From a paper:
Here we systematically reconstruct a part of the metabolism of the GRM3 of Rhodopseudomonas palustris BisB18 by functionally and structurally characterizing three core enzymes, and by reconstituting the reaction sequence in vitro. Furthermore, we show that the acylating aldehyde dehydrogenase (AldDH), encoded within the GRM gene cluster, preferentially uses propionaldehyde as substrate. In summary, characterization of the GRM3 AldDH leads to a revised and detailed reaction mechanism for the ubiquitous (present in all three domains of life) family of acylating aldehyde dehydrogenases. These enzymes take part in numerous pathways including fermentations, detoxifications, other catabolic and central carbon metabolic processes.
Two different conditions were used to crystallize the AldDH with propionyl-CoA. At pH 8.1, AldDH crystallized in the monoclinic space group P 21 with one tetramer per asymmetric unit (ASU). The AldDH crystals diffracted to a resolution of 1.9 Å and the structure was solved by molecular replacement. Interestingly, we observed additional electron density around a cysteine residue in each of the putative active sites, which indicated a covalent modification. Because the enzyme was crystallized in the presence of propionyl-CoA at pH 8.1, we assumed that the corresponding cysteine residue was propionylated and modeled this residue as S-propionylcysteine. The covalent modification fit well into the electron density, to our knowledge the only acyl-enzyme thioester intermediate captured in a crystal structure of an acylating AldDH (pfam00171) to date. In three of the four active sites of the tetramer we also found coenzyme A bound in close proximity to the modified cysteine. In the fourth active site we were able to fit propionyl-CoA, which probably resulted from an additional soaking step before freezing the crystals. Interestingly, we observed that the S-propionylcysteine assumes a different rotamer conformation than the non-acylated cysteine; this has implications for the reaction mechanism. The rotation of the S-propionylcysteine also opens up space for a proton transfer relay that could serve in the deprotonation of the CoA thiol.
Numbering used by the authors:
A (entry chain B), B (entry chain D), C (entry chain A): 86 to 524
D (entry chain C): 43 to 49, 86 to 524
């Protein structure tokens, strides 16, 4: 029985192409069993712990406790076949049905920051829609990704699925990703990664979903529950060491509440840097010569980052907080580290304007703490982000403490929003002329 | 006041970019007024006839009568702002709203087969979704396209719209089209045209919706209403001289009813060619040396085509019919001419199998005449086309005699189906954590 | 042709029963034409003004300018056949369709407060769903109701409807109403009226929709836009002289803003009574010996009510306002007069508790002015009213300045909410076993 | 023209007044519970009936106490109620946003619901009603039939035990120690009952609609199954025998007369007998069965309702093995077996000339119940015509009638099928009041 891992990308694609042809003969009940199997794989406590620990050990990024939550979020709240609704319209001209049907072979690029969550979430959605999926995982997460694919293949084999619904290559690489993106039998590309790989998949001549960059501002105005806001912001920013695409990456605080907010942030585990010499040491540690984030620091804990500049703090410290001007690189750059700059502004309207500016027209994610329905509406409407979270941590936008389903492929540039099974399906219209209008 | 036509593509794109920024400040009521304005433009009887006549004259393709119908179909049954529905979910974690918001500037490539219908349909959908649109019309439809753009800009100015919501260039060209595709301020590309241009917009690094090619088979089995089938098939095949992407392009008839079908086809205006020499004359006329359709004959009437091989017939002749083997170029090629080959097969199951084969995995459009719900289901399910029409003319798939809305941008490889305003919008999720859950 | 007005209730019902049998043979396109026909009847400006003036002059209740708005609201925002959506579910077991189909003959009881609005709203919804309707109008609004029915029948005759889709009797009476309730061919009763007649239609052994009483509190807390709240409250309370079921009938104001609210209410046309002797005069005028509203005062203007106690004011006076304890009859009673008591409370939580109490478990309508999303949510969730309006006049709950459709039959005990065509339809399920599953 | 077709309180109270008062207090407390709480309680009810020992006990006990139905099929129907009754996911939200802000439409509780349950589906209805009503945030007072007293009270106690272990307010689901029609009348009259739900015959439906309260009435049917010449006749015979004999013809949807186009009627009958139909051709034997199963007034004998074909045949001296599932007879349309809703595995066949005649006759013998009808036909035009004209709450094409209840057809299940009051297949939504929340000029974030 195939374990889904192939020596060459071309062999993987051919196998997934044959698999998806056979898959088309399977029932929706079969699909639901396979979907549940993937859930059972990642939600099995032993595998859940193994995937969460292994990703941290292999990538050096994130933390075990939060990957437990994120992997479980992927397993529990990714939509299954119930996502594939049917539209119907009946009248004098008969019945029209609109269905979500498979693309075929989907090629999926997955990140090193959420390797297992994206595989679980992509796999469930793509197989629910009747596709097979070829994964090109990031080489930095090769071992955990290949093991997850093999575990999924083992489970699907036990469930009587066609072999090779979920496949990858023995040696993930840029070149194998290139081969996947260029293979004629790949019908759609899905890229969860940085803007480079997204531009690439959108340059292949193929249908592509691209999950893009963010720089999420969190605005706090004078009407917010400041004590809850501080707790939410620390939790959101430090969740998996700031790896989630939605995670807070700069605070924009109205002046009249900024000090009390800072006070409560420190109460909730923020380590405040005031010494500009200490701040400069941190900028030297976490920024490249080009001014971008140091990969060696991405997804490291606040404790670890502080230890690297000679500062020893206990486990209660969750973020590194500093009040800085808006031009500071911690504000402008998407660090993907639990380093959270705060910019003080005079009014909520200034805060909204600055949040739009620093979000850089990524239109990805933004957060606001405010009880004023008018200011919540104004910021949400103006900033036009794929995800907008009000009065909660950023991960409420992923279904953790907010209503809705979860995803780990959030599509901004291509506009799909929170991808689910429907996103991996072709919309088909079936017209029964002058029949089946039984009203 | 700008008329919407610019000397350079870069000027058109920059003007649309400013226009859309201003458009974001307009109400949904404003959008509805602008949508209605575009409907009023094309549905105005004088403009309706002028657009239909000018398109036929300038392109040499289609017929005036059917372009009246198609332009009216675009003006009347293209969804407006009511397409932009809202999803809501409420519970213990509060309320989550999901909305359709604008992309920004959309670059739209329009074909010379449906120049005005596509402009009307794209404009309504894209403006309804809060976008501006830059059109790159086909050079062979330059004059009618630019006049429509001018008339739209005139109407929108009278309605108080931002200037330059709908723009184009003075000199349409493949060079200007490539310039639009490369322009950084174009946020999404929409290509209604051949596979080459669709592959191109999908190779730009941008979100792109691409139309697809088809080769629509119409299967007729022994349970069909043969008299109605023959009428539907002639009407559908000869609609705008076989220009529509959905139009029937080969008949696959169960042998037991083929002769009765052919008899009724002839009664409905089919000119049957049985002389293999006359057939060869037709092939030499309508096929290039490479075997593809001759541009000079695309969209020409059956009367005109027969006259070019010296056969004079009255206006009651709508299609040219011939019984040929499946390998014949008229079967294999997407002629876009009212030339309709018929292949005879033993059983409905063979008809379904052959229909799948000759559709060439375009998964675009197929048609079936049959009253057997099992065979209707089998063919529709297996052939997996974006549009499937049962017991009607192909154009029932576009809302003309079938339930649903109309479009003239039917997505091919990108899977949106019949594009509408929704297709030109980004999906946005707004999460009100632990509030607005008022159940 | 029949003008739809019959000498006996039995003849009206028999005619409507035959009409609906014939109506079943009409298309959805026919239904849509008839719906548009009724809209055209009431939306014709000259007819709109005639109906509005005639109702006020015949009943003595309401005012002309606002009946213009309400009749237009009924004609413009009552859902048509688009309300009758189709649900579909497809899978291994085939296709299931769920449709909204006619009840048959519906007997509709209409009020003297909104005679023409209810006839328009009921007629459009009931005919859209494929029913016929027998109206039993209130005797006080006899002639305006019969004139509307005759105009509908004339319009429908011209549009080619079966005669007698909409019928009534020449002499409305409680006896004819009882005969409608008792008639075996009436398949559903709809009662828009006071609780006695609603209890009656729910005691007939028939499916019945019943209106409810209300006593709508409007809460204003310290976060509200007080200037806007004052304007909204005056407009909502005095709308058609407080006849609408949704209209504000007591203010519960948080002490922090109560005086400034009263100040702004007076600037918007509130006449404030502080003299307890004058207040006692008003109570003597508007209350019966048993403490309920005087019918002779229901729907009278504030100008008229003040003149009846010897106070002469100009037309800028829209409501009579008094700060009183919660036990005051004007708070406790649904006056249906532009008399608006204000009760002052310590906190928004006290305001919510009191609003729930004085709403008397009608669960009909409540209104809140507050910008705190938490307090808006708390009150909306706790008071459990069929309509809840936030930061607007009460009539925004009927589609006048709020999103959604309008109705003038807001169900009370029967739970349908804002009745529309769906409410007048039977839900039917059509199961195509193992076919038409074409995904 | 093919002649072969085409191949701690336990929830049980001394008086109705006490039960209603307890459920009213319970529902006030329930309003403070979260949707997560409701979901736990819904799952608790599912766990009660789907527990294998309780599933078997409920199914066996209902048959033994009522004398109606059969154990194997009540296992299926009870499991169908537990598995496919919608939960809180039924309570969807509508939203509309624009220049005037945001409007939300929600499904909110009625309060105390009084539910009358039948002796033909006593546990399935309790399970199905309980799940839907609690999902929507109501409490429910059950008034079961005296003939199903013991099994109904046990189920209520088991539900109360489970909900107590899950931390629910006491008495979300209640009933009375002594079920009686008089207690049903008392429940219908109680001021604190906000809605009545009646799963029963036409008299009880009329009664709940005569109370001054909102009532959902799930009425009678007489479901015809039309078979035309385009049908898969072999499958139709199998489906018809299975649907008619399901729980001994107790389900409201079950086939109760065949209307067969003449050209396939004999081949259909041959296949019906192949699939377990015992055909009576002897008019003397047919008269014997009529004397057995019809009362002096001509209605069904309660002693025979829900009895097996085997048992019914034995009562007229005919011994057959357990492969016999229905008693089949070809008769004129006027025959009482056609006209009456027997709720017995007795299935008359009426032969007609054409499918259009079959449709006309099916409409006629369905008696404007507009409840359930079934058609076997592959012709999309005749399927549409019959479905459109007969206007039934449930229409099943090319399957057994119980495919209309989510068993072999798409959709959810219910055991309260509302024709007269029009709710259709009742679910949690049906037990909720629609509420509209209008946020004027805010929360329009498009
Ligand atoms: C938001 C938009 C909306 O407001 S929705 C529209 C719903 N409007 C209402 O329900 C208004 C409630 N009606 C009332 O309060 C009263 O009718 C008011 C306005 C005080 C008028 O007084 P009055 O003339 O005495 O009418 P009434 O209903 O109180 O009773 C008078 C007798 O007439 C009867 N009646 C009632 N409706 C009908 C009818 N359609 N046809 C024949 N008779 C009717 C009543 O039963 C009553 O007779 P009886 O004394 O009960 O025997
Ligand atoms: C991935 C990360 C370690 C970047 O560090 P890095 O040193 O630049 O390493 P990269 O692998 O990304 O860069 C080398 C190439 O590998 C490409 N690449 C990204 N994912 C890849 C994948 N699954 N397979 C093959 N190549 C991949 C990158 O596009 C990049 O191309 P480039 O050299 O042209 O820029 C991390 O810091 C990061 O930026 N993650 C963002 C990705 C993301 O947004 N994921 C969304 C999670 S929901
Ligand atoms: C276009 C047509 C009338 C004539 O074919 P033709 O002689 O090759 O004419 P064209 O060369 O201009 O056809 C498209 C060509 O111009 C380009 N082109 C297409 N649309 C263009 C546009 N709006 N602007 C600029 N260039 C365009 C294409 O890149 C292609 O280039 P190519 O000649 O190198 O292949 C006919 O072949 C046709 O319409 N085919 C199908 C197109 C279609 O799918 N229409 C569906 C509309 S709903
Ligand atoms: C089996 C049955 C037919 C017994 O018939 P019966 O012996 O002649 O009459 P009953 O024993 O029911 O008692 C007579 C009255 O009790 C009433 N009744 C029915 N169910 C009742 C209940 N749960 N509680 C109190 N009274 C009830 C009815 O008014 C019935 O009137 P009826 O004789 O006109 O039918 C009957 O009890 C029954 O439940 N039928 C099911 C009808 C139905 O549509 N059920 C829906 C199943 S999902």
């Amino acid at each position: 029985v195939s374990d889904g891992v192939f020596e060459t990308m071309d062999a993987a694609v051919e196998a997934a192409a044959l698999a998806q042809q056979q898959y088309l003969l399977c029932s929706m009940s079969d699909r639901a069993r396979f979907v549940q199997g993937i859930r059972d794989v990642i939600l099995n406590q032993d595998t859940l712990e193994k995937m969460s620990r292994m990703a941290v050990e292999e990538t050096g990024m994130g933390n075990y406790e939060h990957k437990l939550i994120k992997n479980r979020l992927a397993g529990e709240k990714t939509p299954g076949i119930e996502d594939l609704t049917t539209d119907a319209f009946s009248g004098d001209n008969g019945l029209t049905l609109v269905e979500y049907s498979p693309f075929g072979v989907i090629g999926a690029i997955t990140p090193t920051t959420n390797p297992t969550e994206t595989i679980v979430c992509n796999s469930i959605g793509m197989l629910a829609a009747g596709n097979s999926v070829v994964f090109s995982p990031h080489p930095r997460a090769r071992q955990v990704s290949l093991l997850l694919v093999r575990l999924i293949n083992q489970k699907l084999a036990a469930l009587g699925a066609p072999e090779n619904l979920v496949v990858t290559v023995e040696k993930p690489s840029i070149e194998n990703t290139n081969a996947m993106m260029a293979h004629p039998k790949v019908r759609m590309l899905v890229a969860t990664g940085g803007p480079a790989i997204v531009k690439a998949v959108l340059s292949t001549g193929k249908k592509a979903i691209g999950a893009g960059a963010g720089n999420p501002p969190v605005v706090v105005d004078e009407t917010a529950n400041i004590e809850k806001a501080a707790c939410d912001i620390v939790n959101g920013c430090s969740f998996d060491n700031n790896l989630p695409x939605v995670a807070e990456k700069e605070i924009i605080a109205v002046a009249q509440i900024a000090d009390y907010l800072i006070f409560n942030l420190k109460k909730n585990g923020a380590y405040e840097i005031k010494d500009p010499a200490v701040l400069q040491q941190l900028q030297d540690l976490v920024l490249t010569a080009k001014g971008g984030p140091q990969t060696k620091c991405v997804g490291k804990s606040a404790v670890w980052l502080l230890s690297q500049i000679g500062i020893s703090v206990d486990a209660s410290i969750k973020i590194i907080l500093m009040e800085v001007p808006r031009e500071h690189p911690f504000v402008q750059e998407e660090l993907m580290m639990p380093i959270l700059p705060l910019v003080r502004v005079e009014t909520v309207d200034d805060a909204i304007d600055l949040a739009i500016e620093v979000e850089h027209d990524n239109r990805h994610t933004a957060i606001m703490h405010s009880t004023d329905v008018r200011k919540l509406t104004k910021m949400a409407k103006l900033i036009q982000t794929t995800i907008f979270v009000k009065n909660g941590p950023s991960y409420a936008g992923l279904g953790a403490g907010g209503e809705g389903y979860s995803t780990f492929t959030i599509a901004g540039p291509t506009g799909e929003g929170l991808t689910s099974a429907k996103s991996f399906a072709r919309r088909r219209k079936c017209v029964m002329v002058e029949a089946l209008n039984i009203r």
